[PDB]
Symmetry: D2
Subunit: 382 residues, 4 copies
């Protein structure tokens, strides 16, 4: 009862996943932050990291342990310690102080994909996890346009995550099945082009955008208010932190993807589009990995009364998502074992803040949780 | 499709219920804050106030409208405008600047009860709502002890709500069925003595303690955290407001009832008794009916990370509960129509912060909501 | 002991100033929010509004009262009720849903200025108050460049406030003295070109940017921390509201003026430039005139300990500044009476968040307050 | 340029003072949290701990280092490491899980005092610091009543701090001068009996109650609001933490001292007694030494507008006060050198939240700071 995992993008999230998982297999900690903890048939010792890819010249060729220790100084070794390999960069790190290298510097995208597939066939992952830098993306919608983009080496059109998910389908087809977990904003689970390519190629997809940070807290409050028929007048959410990833996109890149990165959480939960201010995380270096959040919601109660809630928080970013990933990789192996190719909403609805497919929307997360337990073969919690 | 309602204790909650309901039947407002809004077969025009009782000499003999306007100056008339009648005081207002009068000043408790029953038989309510001053109570547990307390005129042992619920059972028996809604802390739904007396006497009981204020918000956050297996280190809740009721109990009365008024919300939701500070509402006069709340929760996430949430709010007390009551009276008539005597957990679990019976506990309120919709004959919301 | 006041830009601030002042002369309210209240020799009845200018075609030609009632419905008349006159628009309202008209549509800037001066000589104000829409400005630094900009009709170079302050100096010279109060961000007090033009032309200038909102609260906390030698690690400030003015500037206009609109409050108060996030107010329509603010500051205390403060607030924008203006117009008449031409730091330091001249900086506002009292001829408060 | 210091009560504050001071003399840290840092003529290496007293049987006879390491595990040695000596207990620890021992178990109070004085004459402190458990005290007002209480061995009347301050005066007289720093609530600086005894016996007194925690933050906001003539409607302050000292007083002891422990900060700063809720710190064990605070203030601004501020914080208790003590001991030696016997308001006003003498009150702390710098022979900061 094992799961082999390949990581794309060896940064803070990835390194916290690895370091946390090491402590969990070494019993140095309890699985707090891992929702399903030890309830699944796959134990923490049964999760094996078979590979890690990056585009940072400072990381490529280092052992996984050397990079993980840069984020978590207490990690001096790892049970599986593969060397970090070169991926495909496209535009990912163009705005960051990273010296980039990529397969597609010396070959076409189509060639780079075939090269990835060959490498991955030897590493043999069950689950590929995407923790790459946030991207100014535009979805395809039609598979034919994705295929043409690859065929024509259309680098200006594609993002790295789009190329990696494409490669994952080709890999899945050659391997007889695999899973791709997309915890970044780029539409994969929510792009019907990729859901169709996945269904056709023995690939399970979870996505998109890991459910951490302020937005899930806003959504929880909105769910409360909806139940009580309290009319939500406005919602303001502020989120700021010190991770370099928050500077990844130019104002232009943000403008280009805004149509797709805008949250639908408020209308999803309330049923009406209450005015809201929900934006990308701002940058302030000394906060490091621990975000400051501030949320303000005002609403109308009975007899014309008006109430206000102000939520503030300090939340550790990478650990939150790292813990979710411990479940998502094990759930990916279950979905693969069951041949549930395409995207799996019962999983996405709980773990993702933009749950795929495009035709499904966010629900209250307690409801999502109970339905996800049932999908996983567990009894509900309450 | 009608419901006749009798109110016990004509103060802020009661008067907001009445004033709000008047605007709702007059279409001057939408039913925000009324969870089931217009989904029930009983409409707002079909709720008739047939009586109101108090012990304040300043209120007894006034028209309901004259008292309601003291709380909501915009109310200049009411569709049903009964005169406020004298109840039984026992210790209720002993610590407040209220000149008290009570039936039991001129007769025994047993006589006072028979007098109430005779009055109520002429007013003919379906539903009796208890919005009296908070009480230093001690539950009975065994019906025999409740019966002996009444029989022996044991005024030092009993609170007003205990005497009123007893009277409600006798009334229910003479009438062929009625309902008693207890939105104050005193155990009625959670006192097996009263649940048994109710079952035997054609009385439906909802209780105890209306689910408003800070505690339901704390409970919602705890539910979120539990789902994610986040270990809750501590919970602090502060609540303060300007309502006279917050001064009702002496330090001694508080000490006497503390065993029973202590929240179990934290252990109920989490399954372990995380250290917590959750206390009665403090007094600060200029806040009036709009409470200030402050909640702090710290918890452990993945890889030993520690996060913190600080929730602040300004919430209008009496409107919140007033809106719940618009549903509870209609649900009481449904339970009565169905002959569901004793206490009804599917209702209590959503509307009450100490849901009866004593053998049931709090659950996440979204789960309670969906189960309450099903009980009411509605389709679930999400 | 009188002061005649001319308003430039008849919007929310201006209209709250007028409406508030009307209630103060009519004794309908106490001067809360007016720092010096009734301590000055000029009473509220002695402040006369002699004129109001706008560029909104919907406002030009209306009585002041008709426009004020749009903001404060309780105002049905005014003691002085002049018709709103046409100003100069330049780029002010280009990004707003306002149909603009301006003198410079039919004449050169130099001509428009001479026209303003002639109009103002008949209205005869002592004090001109600038409450116009926020502007993408670039200061001059050298008076010669300001003069050339006017002479050459260089509309692309100038903002309305720059043209109005220029006109104010010419007016002051013809009149024998006047004062210009700049409560918007555009550098006037902090542009040596204008300070020199003012000194030479019998003009007193107060500026720049009224001291209201979140920034003064952040500054107060920083002052506290500085005193205790607490090392400030980071400062994050979020501010959002529903006023149309918050949409006045494009991303480009913001980029153009950012060099000058960036706060120096943190380094001014602390002496070192702690990392900070302090940005323009964001837009969320239902908040209206009542801003939501959120501030987070973390700092190092003794023995390596680290503390955190989270401040949230709801603050009414236009009333705050309206109240300051009641003092600033009276202080302007005192400065004029004393012939203190140029800019007056003892006033600016308390009332303005970028106190002029360019060579002076922010100080703790309690210190500024006591020095401002001394300047005004009052005894200090504590 | 040296100062010898004796500590009364070797708990969290005391141990943080010692541990912090050790790091400061060893250059392992900068003096953050020490307001006057290195501006005084006495450097950190020049502060010598000559003694430490307790009543805990678990601490008496231990080296100072062994006790300090229980609070700060990083401390493995101290430059001066005296054995902890037995004090006088009276009622101090009666409500805590501490096995108490005291001189007055085997002798009268008068004898116990003479014994302390003899011990202290050999240890030879310049400055005695009182960091003992909070006490249910009642001040004397008249010195004659203090003298009679000691003479008559009136243990039920006296607290430990009262006996220690008395002993300090007798010690000061025998030594030719000393200083007593009272950072706990018990009136010493604010009890004219002790101020007179001190003046007569060559004793300098600083007191009372160290200026840390939520109250100084509330006071800072109030000072801001007062300046702007904003009318404060209400002030609510919540403070909770995990230190055992918060359980020191029974409800009865709290009732007995309430007349004296009630804050006057609001009226002191505003000049009118705005309704307020400011209470002793509540207990929640897992918070440890890091308090959670919540403050809510609502106020009236211009034109009838109403604003609200909600401040939340996590603040490390013992470090805050520990840092103040680094200054207070050096300032005590300066006051002693100057023969300024009695109490010194210029010091108290900045460092203490109930600044002595009884005839002086709190002022804005920035004003207190500048006056304290002037007293100390420094130039003001801004
Ligand atoms: N709680 C969270 O941290 C959170 C929540 C939801 C989503 N996310 C998303 O997760 C992603 C990772 O976040 P992070 O904080 O770890 O960021 P990070 O910058 O620390 O790490 C990103 C890593 O990806 C590498 N990389 C960039 N482009 C790549 C490419 N084309 N191929 C291979 N490697 C590439 C970078 O060099 C870096 O090592 C981001 O997209 C972020 O938006 C994070
Ligand atoms: N959101 C909320 O307001 C909220 C929430 C949960 C529970 N409650 C509970 O609801 C109750 C009512 O709250 P309120 O704010 O309306 O208080 P309130 O003081 O305004 O009104 C109480 C009324 O009951 C009357 N009364 C007191 N004892 C009585 C007796 N023995 N018989 C008849 N009348 C009596 C009083 O004179 C007064 O008119 C309290 O027990 C409170 O704890 C309130
Ligand atoms: N608390 C506060 O409201 C606050 C604080 C500091 C500064 N300010 C500044 O005060 C100014 C006014 O704020 P507001 O909320 O009243 O905005 P507003 O949009 O309500 O009013 C601005 C008015 O100026 C008019 N106007 C625009 N350009 C003009 C021009 N060139 N000549 C004459 N009239 C012109 C507009 O038509 C409108 O009537 C803004 O610059 C704002 O940044 C406001
Ligand atoms: N920021 C702060 O910690 C803060 C601020 C202001 C005031 N204070 C006050 O400082 C005092 C110390 O606080 P703490 O947190 O260090 O408490 P603590 O309980 O950790 O330490 C108190 C110590 O005093 C000892 N003690 C008790 N009675 C004594 C007696 N009669 N003689 C000698 N020793 C005695 C105890 O055994 C213990 O070692 C308390 O009065 C507290 O109210 C603390
Ligand atoms: Cl999270
Ligand atoms: Cl977020
Ligand atoms: Cl949710
Ligand atoms: Cl509520
Ligand atoms: Cl509450
Ligand atoms: Cl819940
Ligand atoms: Cl303000
Ligand atoms: Cl602001
Ligand atoms: Cl300041
Ligand atoms: Cl502090
Ligand atoms: Cl405190
Ligand atoms: Cl202060
Ligand atoms: Mg979707
Ligand atoms: Mg129960
Ligand atoms: Mg300046
Ligand atoms: Mg005093």
């Amino acid at each position: 009862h094992m799961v082999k995992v390949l990581i794309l993008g060896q940064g803070y999230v990835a390194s916290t996943f690895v370091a946390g998982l090491e402590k969990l297999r070494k019993g140095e900690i309890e699985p707090y932050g891992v929702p399903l903890a030890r309830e699944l048939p796959i134990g923490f010792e049964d999760i094996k990291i078979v590979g890690s890819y990056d585009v940072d010249r400072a990381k490529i060729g280092k052992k996984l342990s050397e990079v993980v220790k840069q984020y978590w100084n207490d990690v001096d070794s790892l049970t599986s310690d593969p060397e970090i390999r070169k991926g495909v960069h496209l535009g990912s790190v163009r705005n960051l102080p990273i010296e980039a290298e990529g397969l597609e510097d010396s070959m076409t995208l189509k060639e780079a994909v075939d090269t990835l597939v060959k490498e991955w066939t030897e590493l043999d992952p069950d689950v590929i996890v995407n923790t790459c830098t946030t991207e100014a993306f535009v979805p395809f919608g039609n598979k034919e346009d994705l295929l043409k983009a690859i065929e024509n080496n259309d680098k200006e059109r594609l993002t790295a995550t789009q190329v990696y998910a494409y490669a994952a389908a080709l890999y899945a087809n050659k391997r007889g099945g695999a899973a791709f977990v997309n915890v970044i904003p780029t539409f994969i689970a929510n792009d019907p082009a990729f859901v169709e390519l996945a269904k056709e190629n023995n690939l399970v997809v979870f996505g998109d955008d890991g459910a951490t940070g302020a937005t899930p807290f806003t959504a929880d409050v909105l769910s409360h208010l909806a139940q009580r028929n309290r009319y939500v007048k406005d919602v303001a959410q502020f989120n700021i932190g010190g991770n370099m990833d928050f500077l990844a996109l130019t104002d232009d890149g943000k403008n280009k993807s805004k149509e797709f990165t805008k949250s639908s959480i408020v209308k999803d939960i309330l049923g009406y589009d209450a005015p809201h201010y929900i934006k990308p995380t701002g940058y302030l270096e000394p906060l490091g990995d621990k975000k400051f959040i501030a949320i303000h919601i005002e609403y109308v109660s009975f007899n014309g009364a008006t109430d206000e809630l102000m939520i503030n928080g300090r939340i550790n970013d990478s650990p939150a998502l790292g813990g979710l990933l411990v479940d998502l990789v094990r759930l990916g192996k279950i979905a693969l074992d069951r041949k549930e190719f395409g995207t799996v909403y019962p999983v996405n609805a709980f773990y993702m803040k933009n749950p795929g497919p495009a035709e499904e929307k966010n629900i209250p997360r307690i409801i999502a949780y109970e339905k996800m337990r049932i999908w996983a073969g567990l009894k509900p919690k309450w």
